Each structure stands twice: as structure tokens, then as C-alpha cells.
Amino acid sequence: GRMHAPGKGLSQSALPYRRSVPTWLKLTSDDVKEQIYKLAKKGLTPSQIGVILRDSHGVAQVRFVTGNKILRILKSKGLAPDLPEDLYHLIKKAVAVRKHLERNRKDKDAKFRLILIESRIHRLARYYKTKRVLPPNWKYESSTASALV
Amino acid sequence: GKCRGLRTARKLRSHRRDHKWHDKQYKKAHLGTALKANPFGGASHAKGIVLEKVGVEAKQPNSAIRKCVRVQLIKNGKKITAFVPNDGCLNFIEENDEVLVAGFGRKGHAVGDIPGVRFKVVKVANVSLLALYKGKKERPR
Amino acid sequence: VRMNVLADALKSINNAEKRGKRQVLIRPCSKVIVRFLTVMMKHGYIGEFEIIDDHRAGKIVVNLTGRLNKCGVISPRFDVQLKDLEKWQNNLLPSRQFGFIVLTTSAGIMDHEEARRKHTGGKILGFFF
RNA sequence: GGUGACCACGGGUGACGGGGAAUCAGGGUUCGAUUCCGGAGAGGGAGCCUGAGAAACGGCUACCACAUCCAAGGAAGGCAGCAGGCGCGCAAAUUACCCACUCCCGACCCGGGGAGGUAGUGACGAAAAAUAACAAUACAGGACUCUUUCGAGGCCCUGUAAUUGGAAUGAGUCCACUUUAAAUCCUUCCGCGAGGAUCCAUUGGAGGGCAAGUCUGGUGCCAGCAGCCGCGGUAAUUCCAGCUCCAAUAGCGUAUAUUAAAGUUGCUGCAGUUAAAAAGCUCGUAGUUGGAUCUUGGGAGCGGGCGUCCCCGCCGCCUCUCGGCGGGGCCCGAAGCAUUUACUUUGAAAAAAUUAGAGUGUUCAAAGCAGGCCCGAGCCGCCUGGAUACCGCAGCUAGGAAUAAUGGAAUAGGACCGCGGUUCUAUUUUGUUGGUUUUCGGAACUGAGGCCAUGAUUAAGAGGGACGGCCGGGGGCAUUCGUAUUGCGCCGCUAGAGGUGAAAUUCUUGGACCGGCGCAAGACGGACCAGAGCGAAAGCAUUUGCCAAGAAUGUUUUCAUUAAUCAAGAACGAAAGUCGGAGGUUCGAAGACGAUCAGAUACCGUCGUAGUUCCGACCAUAAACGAUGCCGACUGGCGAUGCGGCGGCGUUAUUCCCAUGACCCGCCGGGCAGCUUCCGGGAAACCAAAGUCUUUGGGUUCCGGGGGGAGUAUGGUUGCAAAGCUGAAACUUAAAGGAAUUGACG
RNA sequence: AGAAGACGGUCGAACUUGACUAUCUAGAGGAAGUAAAAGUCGUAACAAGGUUUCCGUAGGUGAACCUGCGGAAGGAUCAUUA
Ligand SMILES: [Mg+2]
Ligand SMILES: [Mg+2]
Ligand SMILES: [Mg+2]
Ligand SMILES: [Mg+2]
Ligand SMILES: [Mg+2]
Ligand SMILES: [Mg+2]
Ligand SMILES: [Mg+2]
Ligand SMILES: [Mg+2]
Ligand SMILES: [Mg+2]
Ligand SMILES: [Mg+2]
Ligand SMILES: [Mg+2]
Ligand SMILES: [Mg+2]
Ligand SMILES: [Mg+2]
Numbered sequence A: 001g002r003m004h005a006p007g008k009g010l011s012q013s014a015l016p017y018r019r020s021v022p023t024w025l026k027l028t029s030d031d032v033k034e035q036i037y038k039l040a041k042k043g044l045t046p047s048q049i050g051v052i053l054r055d056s057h058g059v060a061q062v063r064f065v066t067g068n069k070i071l072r073i074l075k076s077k078g079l080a081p082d083l084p085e086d087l088y089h090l091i092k093k094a095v096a097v098r099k100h101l102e103r104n105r106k107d108k109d110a111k112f113r114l115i116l117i118e119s120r121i122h123r124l125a126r127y128y129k130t131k132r133v134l135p136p137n138w139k140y141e142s143s144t145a146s147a148l149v
Numbered sequence B: 001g002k003c004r005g006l007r008t009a010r011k012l013r014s015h016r017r018d019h020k021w022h023d024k025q026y027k028k029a030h031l032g033t034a035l036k037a038n039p040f041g042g043a044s045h046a047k048g049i050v051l052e053k054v055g056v057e058a059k060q061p062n063s064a065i066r067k068c069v070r071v072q073l074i075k076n077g078k079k080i081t082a083f084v085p086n087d088g089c090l091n092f093i094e095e096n097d098e099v100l101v102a103g104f105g106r107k108g109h110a111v112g113d114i115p116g117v118r119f120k121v122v123k124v125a126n127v128s129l130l131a132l133y134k135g136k137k138e139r140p141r
Numbered sequence C: 001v002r003m004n005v006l007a008d009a010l011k012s013i014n015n016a017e018k019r020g021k022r023q024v025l026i027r028p029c030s031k032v033i034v035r036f037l038t039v040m041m042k043h044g045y046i047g048e049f050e051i052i053d054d055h056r057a058g059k060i061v062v063n064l065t066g067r068l069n070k071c072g073v074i075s076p077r078f079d080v081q082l083k084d085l086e087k088w089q090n091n092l093l094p095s096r097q098f099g100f101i102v103l104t105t106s107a108g109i110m111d112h113e114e115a116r117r118k119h120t121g122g123k124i125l126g127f128f129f
Numbered sequence D: 001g002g003u004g005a006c007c008a009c010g011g012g013u014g015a016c017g018g019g020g021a022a023u024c025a026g027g028g029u030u031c032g033a034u035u036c037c038g039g040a041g042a043g044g045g046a047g048c049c050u051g052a053g054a055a056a057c058g059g060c061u062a063c064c065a066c067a068u069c070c071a072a073g074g075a076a077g078g079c080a081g082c083a084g085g086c087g088c089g090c091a092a093a094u095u096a097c098c099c100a101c102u103c104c105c106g107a108c109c110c111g112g113g114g115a116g117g118u119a120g121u122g123a124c125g126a127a128a129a130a131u132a133a134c135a136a137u138a139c140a141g142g143a144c145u146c147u148u149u150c151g152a153g154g155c156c157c158u159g160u161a162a163u164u165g166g167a168a169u170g171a172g173u174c175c176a177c178u179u180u181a182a183a184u185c186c187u188u189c190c191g192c193g194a195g196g197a198u199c200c201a202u203u204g205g206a207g208g209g210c211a212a213g214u215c216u217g218g219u220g221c222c223a224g225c226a227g228c229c230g231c232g233g234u235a236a237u238u239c240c241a242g243c244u245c246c247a248a249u250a251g252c253g254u255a256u257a258u259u260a261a262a263g264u265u266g267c268u269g270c271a272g273u274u275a276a277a278a279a280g281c282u283c284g285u286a287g288u289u290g291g292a293u294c295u296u297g298g299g300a301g302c303g304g305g306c307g308u309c310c311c312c313g314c315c316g317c318c319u320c321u322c323g324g325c326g327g328g329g330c331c332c333g334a335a336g337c338a339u340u341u342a343c344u345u346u347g348a349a350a351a352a353a354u355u356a357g358a359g360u361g362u363u364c365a366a367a368g369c370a371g372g373c374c375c376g377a378g379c380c381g382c383c384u385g386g387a388u389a390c391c392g393c394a395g396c397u398a399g400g401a402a403u404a405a406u407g408g409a410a411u412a413g414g415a416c417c418g419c420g421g422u423u424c425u426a427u428u429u430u431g432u433u434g435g436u437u438u439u440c441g442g443a444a445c446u447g448a449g450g451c452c453a454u455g456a457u458u459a460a461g462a463g464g465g466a467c468g469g470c471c472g473g474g475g476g477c478a479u480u481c482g483u484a485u486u487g488c489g490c491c492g493c494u495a496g497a498g499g500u501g502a503a504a505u506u507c508u509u510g511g512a513c514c515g516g517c518g519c520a521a522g523a524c525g526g527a528c529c530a531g532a533g534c535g536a537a538a539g540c541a542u543u544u545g546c547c548a549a550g551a552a553u554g555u556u557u558u559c560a561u562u563a564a565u566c567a568a569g570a571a572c573g574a575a576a577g578u579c580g581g582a583g584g585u586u587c588g589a590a591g592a593c594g595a596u597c598a599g600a601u602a603c604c605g606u607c608g609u610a611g612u613u614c615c616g617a618c619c620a621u622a623a624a625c626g627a628u629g630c631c632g633a634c635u636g637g638c639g640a641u642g643c644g645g646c647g648g649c650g651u652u653a654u655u656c657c658c659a660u661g662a663c664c665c666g667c668c669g670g671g672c673a674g675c676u677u678c679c680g681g682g683a684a685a686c687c688a689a690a691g692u693c694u695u696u697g698g699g700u701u702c703c704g705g706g707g708g709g710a711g712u713a714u715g716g717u718u719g720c721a722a723a724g725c726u727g728a729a730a731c732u733u734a735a736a737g738g739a740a741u742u743g744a745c746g
Numbered sequence E: 001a002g003a004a005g006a007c008g009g010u011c012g013a014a015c016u017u018g019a020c021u022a023u024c025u026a027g028a029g030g031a032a033g034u035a036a037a038a039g040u041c042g043u044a045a046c047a048a049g050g051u052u053u054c055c056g057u058a059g060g061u062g063a064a065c066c067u068g069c070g071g072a073a074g075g076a077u078c079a080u081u082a
């Protein structure tokens, strides 16, 4: 029921049986990989691309259209970010909590939401150390964090 | 609930270990105290010298005087009251006479009335009250 | 969380047959589920179950009959060494006259009778009777 | 440098280690100084000779620790060999006889052996097993038969007696023999050896638990009884006695250690609303625990019940680069090796005794391991044993691959004489030995090609992460307002008012109280306000701004096992409390008076300090309470509501519609809640959950084991201190307690 | 060959003084508990226990105790009638 909160909710995405492309679609495995390509270039996260591609554009799921999933398309060409998008969203968040804690030293609430956030960082980190996308050294540091965003 | 897992043989052993210093019947037996405290140094009976005869007043609901002996044990020099069982037997025992005192059956509890008397006399000058109060063996002289 | 997908399922197919429910679905599904349910099919303990193939995990839908008093699951799969098999089937089944400890040996998943014919031990899963 | 909470290191032991023991439905629990194995020490240590072999104690050297004789110069001491004594002690044998058995040392058939055997002592303990039987009477009865019954025939019986009666035997004693070494003991037997008054069964009980007398004497809350429940105060089923009976009974009692009993230590397998009990809350390292997902259907046959349905050997792969059972095969020899285990099954190895248990007239049995036989002994000798199973874990071997981990290709690599460049270096070969250079064989390195359907399982009604529109007394920081409140300023009028089961201290014509208008300071945010809202729990409400943060829903957004709970370790934690500081609106411990009361150092009054108010540090606890751990699964209804979404049928409005927005009617997710019920629970109260529990185990955290003593003492630690945290025992104690019932008194 | 002897060194009992820890105890006088169970002074609690009760904290008091503040209902109200 979530990692760090009471709320035991469920709201998630859900795909069909069918996987084969849905025939509206023109494009083809190339023209999608041409487009993911240009969006990442412009500066968007692997999530954020998947977004643009569905609402405005056409692709239910990149994964089905092309062979592989978005990250692999960026990574095998070298547009992938330094660290995982998923993580620096937490780091960027932490640094934001840090900031106003450093002006407002009363906020007891912010002093989970930091501690929790710190803990959801470390936790993440130490698979990225076993799945080896991060080198076995990198570590948080409060000071060096603000830079890392 | 319980830990239930499969490489949990210790969390279990070590659980069922300490949750015996909350048993009462083992903390007598395995701690130390008992051997240290009971004048009967872990020993079934013990010999001691009758230093005086003392009547004890029984616990309220039953009025009566119980007829016991202050003993001093040889091995310790630890003192004692021992209720001399069966009628008119205090009459036998004189001062300074060597008695073999055994327990009461409650092992530490005082028995029934006789408030705070764990021990009962058996022998007297190598005789045995059972023989005297039956009139089989007489008093030695 | 979902640790053991039997206990999950078997609770919900004991726990229907009490209510007299005609049939039930079991949410997570597995190979081990199928393979241990097909054992229950032979001695009659259930009827024909029809596994849905949601693309991910699986669902099953079990035709029940009246016949299952209880099925349960021994949760850690202790390793049963054939000499113990008796001592278990003493204290885990209502009689020596029926009752089936499903377990999982060298030669597949099967009841205790079939591990005894082949003379193998292995890991206890559960029991229905 | 090495070890450590997978708990070291430190301390303790009523600890020489195993082999086993008694207990025991299965699982354990304690004991194993105990004859078998293994270790150690000869008062204690150290060092020593000597010795293959010893740091040897029936050697010695001191010392220490012990102790003997003395001619006072000196000398000799080691039972934890056997006997014995002393002391200790609840608690344990004879200065016995002997090498005859089994064995050992010697130069050895020949001596010696307190190793050892044999006696004695010996309710440590185990086996067997007398303490009478039987006929006829006398009777005392009761199933056939006979009798309406009373009676009788009697095959049946059984009670007591007469013992009426002889028969039978042993306990003893003791001729004799065996035994043995000589005995003894046992086995053999001559001879004597049973009418109870003997050849004499006792220990506890006789209310219940618990089998057995409101039989009879005596005492009279004494004596006394009673493991617990209890009895005893003038008829005691309870004390002391008498008679009768019961249990076991040659044994039987109490002393306590310990096991079942204990579903009261709970792995199997306890408990946590109230009974003893879930941390205040949360984070979190070790530990434990962790979704799904990967060779199959099928084939070929033999065998049970034209085909169908049970039942078996087969389709571990690779190698052949390796053996060989001038070119060979054939396949075993080697290894890729079982990815790397976990798991399972088969071997082998497991000292005997013990154990389980084959075999066996020990007269049976504990035992013993022999015995059996063949034999009239002429056989001058045959025949068989001394079975077997278990023997944890680890270790070794071999099958299997059910499940659990674990592994392999992704900034490219396996193979494919695929090809070469560079280098290396082995060795066959040039009738031999050297030199040079080759060919080739094997490494190492590395240019450049071919092929490889060439590599990513999926996304969890798991999680993590993005975005969307709301949401909310969530948190901070600013800002704004409201009243009342007391304070004061002024003005008006006037004498009482506050307080009260009644009154006074009190406030007051020095004009209080009241009325009006003004300012003041600080408080707190009324109604709206709810089984309404949010947060973690403390939690959280005047307007507006800003600052982060969050649930939920929505989502053919991305990541892809990342997760749950968690010793250890952290964050926060009313009030009260404490140091600093700011402030003093009321209320108000403390404190002062008035009453009330037998008194009130209490309540009820009138004052009022700390504090309640702020900002800064600490403290770290509640009935911190839903007296309900957290995650996860499943099982019924029915109503409501907060949020989000979705759909529809409404309309008020709102405009020409719209968009809305406001109502209505549905559905959906997740929230706070309600009722109802023979799910099912539940000692009960009760509980959609406290349900899924003898039909016992989804994961995991904490924690209780009669009540007090006691949350005490002591120790440690934190704190400025209150105190916080950790946290015993002796002793005492039989219930304390919980749920419901009648009572009965408020 | 070779004794008595002597210089050195090594294991080292032993002895002397410190340290630690273990265990065990002597103690003027002080304060609890329990016994236990029938003394005095009250009467705190259970009935609306005469003042709903209880927790924590604080302060007080001859004694139960009392009073603040914040709690609790384990209440003496599952409601207060838009
Ligand atoms: Mg967590
Ligand atoms: Mg000792
Ligand atoms: Mg000695
Ligand atoms: Mg020695
Ligand atoms: Mg020596
Ligand atoms: Mg000696
Ligand atoms: Mg003895
Ligand atoms: Mg001997
Ligand atoms: Mg015996
Ligand atoms: Mg006799
Ligand atoms: Mg009785
Ligand atoms: Mg026991
Ligand atoms: Mg049992």
C-alpha cells in the first residue's frame, strides 16, 4: 500500500490483450524512432516523450511499434541522460525541500518529506549500484546535490 | 504473529530462550538464588542442632499453637524453624539434641497453617519420630 | 505482499467451498497452481478449471463441486525425507483412509501416494482432504 | 593487519568430552562425574633425569603448599593402586581369599599381578516368587429340576465355622554329594521339620481429588488434623482411640532434582478489546521474507485392463580435441562438468556395549549366547550359530531435476579450414651434429571480411518514477479582521454589587456598580461545526499573499522486481516540566483571606506567584485510546457521506445556446463513517471484521506467562533536573483478575 | 677420561608491591516491603461513594489525599429533538 504513506490506493495504466499495431498508424518503427529522437534532442524525459507521442501524436506504445522501449532507443544512440530520469526527479525534489527548510527552520512537516525523500533516493540508488547503471561510488551529498540537477 | 520462516531457526531458538527468564519455575532452577538462599543447600534433608522450642500461632481461620523447633544447621550455621509433626512429639525433643530436618512437600512454600515454616523434623538423636510417637524405639540415654 | 501464491489461491478455494460457492477465480495464477490443482482434479477434490490468459500473470476459474472440506498450504516448503512422510500424514490429514499431501519431487508435483509408489521424497506444498 | 552482533570479545557452569538414560501420542527435556571409547591430573606449579616410547609421580629437585623419626648434628613424607581411618558430611563395603578363569611383562610353559576373579557387606536397583490347598460336614447362600408358595432332588455353587479330616509341600535344620582353589553360594538329596494360641505381612489411608464406614470410645478452635480444598468451639463421617474395609502389597512409606502431565515456553504448537499483553508515532542498516514468466505436448514399442484407457524401457547434452575394448573404424578411456549450488533418491563409511530385534525348555525372566544334534557313547562324531535395522549434522559416492536461489550475448559476441598481418615457441623432418632459414604443430597477439530468422518475456488489481485537473481546519512563513476582556481616557446618572445550600474578604457618594463615547494590551478565533475535513502521532479551523509538501482519482505516460517488515541506528512527539530570552489579555498550582464543616491545611467563596501568551534551547511521557502492529490474500447484506473519476434523464438558473456552475439519477476507484444477519468467529461482552485456528503454519515486526514485592533495589546510560531509558532477587502470597447471573443497596 | 666447583643464558616455582575483575561476607545507624491477619485518626475508592472516575505531569497537604494544565472514558450521556 505505497512505500511511504498510508494511502493504499490503485490507479494505474492497463493495456489490452492485443499488441499488434492499430492500423491508424502510419509512421513505422523508423518514423517513431525519428521522432523520439527529435524530442529527446530538444530536452525531454523518457516519460515525457511517451506522453507527447500518445496525446497529440499517435503511438499508444512505442514498445509495440518499434522493437524496444524508449530508453533503449535513446541509450543505444547516446541521447540518454547522465543518471536515471526517475532518480533525479527525487534529487531535484530533495533540493527543493532543502531550500525552503534553509529559510524556514520550523517546518516540521518538510523534515519528513526531506527524510522520506532522502530515503526514497538511497533506496533507489542501491539497486542502480547492483544493476550497475551508476558507478559503485556515487553517493548523495546535500552539498553536491544542488549542482547535480 | 510468529516468525514462521525457513532460515529462522535462530530468531526462533533465541526467541524461546529469553522467554524463559519470564518463566517462574526455571528462574528458581537455572538462575542461582535458590542454591544460594535455601538453608538446605540443594540438599534433600539436613542435620542441625535444636537451639530452642517455639510455638507458632496458626493463620487466622484456624486457631492453634503449632509446636516447632528453632534449628541451626551444621553445614551453614543457618537458622530455621521446623514444625515437629504429630501430636505430643515436641515433648520428646529436648534442647541441644541433633535433628534430621527434611522439607514439607511444597519445596519452599510454607505448608497450609504454620506461617513461614518450610521444614519438618524427622529424626532426633538417631531415632526417627515415627518410631518414638509409635513407641517402638525409646529415647536413647 | 504476495509472498506465496498458493496460500493466496488455496485460501480462496477453501474459502468459497465453505460458502457453497459454485465456482471461483484465483487472481494471481501460476504454474505451481495449475500443477497442484490438476492433482486435486484426479481424486475428485474439484471439477474442471479453465485458466484465463490475461497477458500478464494468469487468472483461473475453478469448478468446485461439494467435495472439498479444506485445502491448505504448509508455508515453508519443508523438505520431506520419506521416513518423515508418515509422521506428517499422521498429523496433517484426518485419517489414513483418504487425504492427500500434495508435494513436489524430482519426478514432478504429485500427491503423497504417488511419491510413495515411485519411492521419492521432496518438498511439501500443502494438503487437501 | 585478523574477529564482530550469522553476536565476537568479555563473564559465568552444581562442565572432564563422546558413545547412552528416563522420560516419553509425534516434537522435545533434562541427565549423562556411570564399566565402553576419547581427553586430563596425581596437594600445586616448574623443572628435571631417565628412557622408543614419559616432561613419567608406587623417581627425583626445589620452591610453595602438606606432613613423619631425632642422639637437635640431621633424617626420611605423598592412597585421585587395593584394603582401612579421619574429616567432611542428607548421603555410600572387608586390614577377607586367590592366580583356578582373561590377559600382561619378563630372559619366560615355571613368577607376579589388590590388573582381575572369589567370597563378605550391601530394600543403589531388576527377575522369579511361599506366606497355603483340598474332600467331607455343619451350615450360609444362588443359575437346572421339582414346588401356587412353604418345601424338596440335586447335577451347580460359594460364605463362615468344626478343623472333622487326613494329603501336599516348602522356610528351617542337617546325614550325604556337587561346586570351587577351598570353600561358600546355587542345583541333588538321605533324616527330622504345619492344626494356629501357628513357621504370625505393613504402610498409608478411610470427607474429595481418590478405592475405603454421618461404625463405636475420648477431646472439645485444645490438643490437634490437613501436599490443596479443609476439620476441631459438647452427637468430629476431619482430632486421639476401638472395631470393619481398601491399595498396593513383600515391599512399602516421606526428604526432595526432573519428565509427562505443560495446548502453563507452544518448531510442531500458546497468547496480546477487556483477563498478564501492540512501541506515541514514523524513518531505517543487519535478519527474515519476497509475483508471474523458459520442453512441450507429443513419438516408438513391450506389458495390464480395428481401436480408446491404465502401466514400462526410449528419443544428460557435448566431445570423438582425447584412448583403442600406410588409412582405419569401433567406441570406451579424458573433459566441456554435474552454470553454481540448494533439494531429493542409491551406495560406501559408519567401534563394540547400549538400543531396536532375528535365533535359542536360563525349568520361566531379567538374563545367557549358546546350543543343538548325531549318537545305547562304537559318533570313538555330526550340525548350526554368535541374525539384522538405526546410527543426527558435516564429510564421501552415485541417480533425479518437482521447486529456491544463482548464472551466462547489449559501448559485442559465439561459432563458422570463414581469411589474413605481428610475434612466439615446441618439436617431427632434411645417412648424423651445428648454423641459417623454411614447412608445420601449439600458444599469444591482432588487421579484414562471410554467416548467426543474430541478444531486451512482460508489465503486477507489486512497486518505484513522469504528467493532468481538482482536493483537503495537512506544514511553514508573512499579512488581515472580529469580538469580547481587562486596562485606561473622557462624559451621564446615581448608591449599592459580586458573590453566592445563605453570606463576607472584597469592591465602594474619594460615586463604585451601571450607561455613553473614546483609545490599550494581550487572548482567543464563537455560530457556522457535523460519527463533517485533513496529517503520523502527537495532529490540525478569521481574510489575503507567498513558500514548499501530500493523499486519492485520472492516465494503450516512462523504469522494470526495484518490494514487506524490520534488531542496530534516526525524524517528530499535548500537556505538564526546565534553562535562556520576549509579554503580563484572562484563567490560575502555589500562595492570602471569607465561609462550610466536629476539621477542611478540601470542596464553595474572594484575592494571585509560577505558568498559561511569544521567540530560542532541552525533556521525551498519556486512558499518547479504535485500550485492535504493519504489509498481504479471501468471505454477506444493506443503506448514507468526503474526494476524484466516469455515465445518464433531470431541471433552477444562465444567455440564443453553451462552458458551466448549482440540484436529480446511476456506475467506478480508493476515504472517513452507519446499520443488519444463526458467514464465521468469539470466555464473554462483542467483532465485516476480533471472519479464514486441533479443518493448527501468507510475510514479518514487538511482546505476556498467577499476584505483590516492583516498575522497587542495584548496575549502566541520557538529562542542567523532574526524571528518561535499561532493570533483578529474598520474601510473601492463594487466589488476584476477566466476561457475563441472579441478588441487594445507590 | 674426568669430579668439585665457578662466569654467562633459558624455562621458571616462589616471594614482594601495585591493577583489574569474580565471588563471598563484617558493620554503628537509616528506610521499605511483607507479615498480618483485631491498635488511633480519619474515610480516599466501589452506588451520582456524597467531589464521574482514572493517566502524565506539576505543585501542594497529618492520610487517604487535594489543586492546576493537558488528557481519559474503563460514564453517570452511542440523542437533544431547525
Ligand atoms: Mg516501510
Ligand atoms: Mg563455584
Ligand atoms: Mg590427596
Ligand atoms: Mg602425567
Ligand atoms: Mg609431575
Ligand atoms: Mg599412591
Ligand atoms: Mg545411598
Ligand atoms: Mg577386586
Ligand atoms: Mg525389586
Ligand atoms: Mg510370612
Ligand atoms: Mg481422600
Ligand atoms: Mg515439565
Ligand atoms: Mg503434550
Ligand SMILES: [Mg+2]
Residues within 6 Å of the ligand: D264, D270, D271
Ligand atoms: Mg497461556
Ligand SMILES: [Mg+2]
Residues within 6 Å of the ligand: none
Ligand atoms: Mg498504536
Ligand SMILES: [Mg+2]
Residues within 6 Å of the ligand: D525, D542
Ligand atoms: Mg469565526
Ligand SMILES: [Mg+2]
Residues within 6 Å of the ligand: none
Ligand atoms: Mg529501537
Ligand SMILES: [Mg+2]
Residues within 6 Å of the ligand: D575
Ligand atoms: Mg509542551
Ligand SMILES: [Mg+2]
Residues within 6 Å of the ligand: none
Ligand atoms: Mg510550557
Ligand SMILES: [Mg+2]
Residues within 6 Å of the ligand: none
Ligand atoms: Mg521564561
Ligand SMILES: [Mg+2]
Residues within 6 Å of the ligand: none
Ligand atoms: Mg477558588
Ligand SMILES: [Mg+2]
Residues within 6 Å of the ligand: none
Ligand atoms: Mg509508555
Ligand SMILES: [Mg+2]
Residues within 6 Å of the ligand: D690
Ligand atoms: Mg486476538
Ligand SMILES: [Mg+2]
Residues within 6 Å of the ligand: D693, D696
Ligand atoms: Mg496457530
Ligand SMILES: [Mg+2]
Residues within 6 Å of the ligand: none
Ligand atoms: Mg508473574
Ligand SMILES: [Mg+2]
Residues within 6 Å of the ligand: none
Ligand atoms: Mg482494569
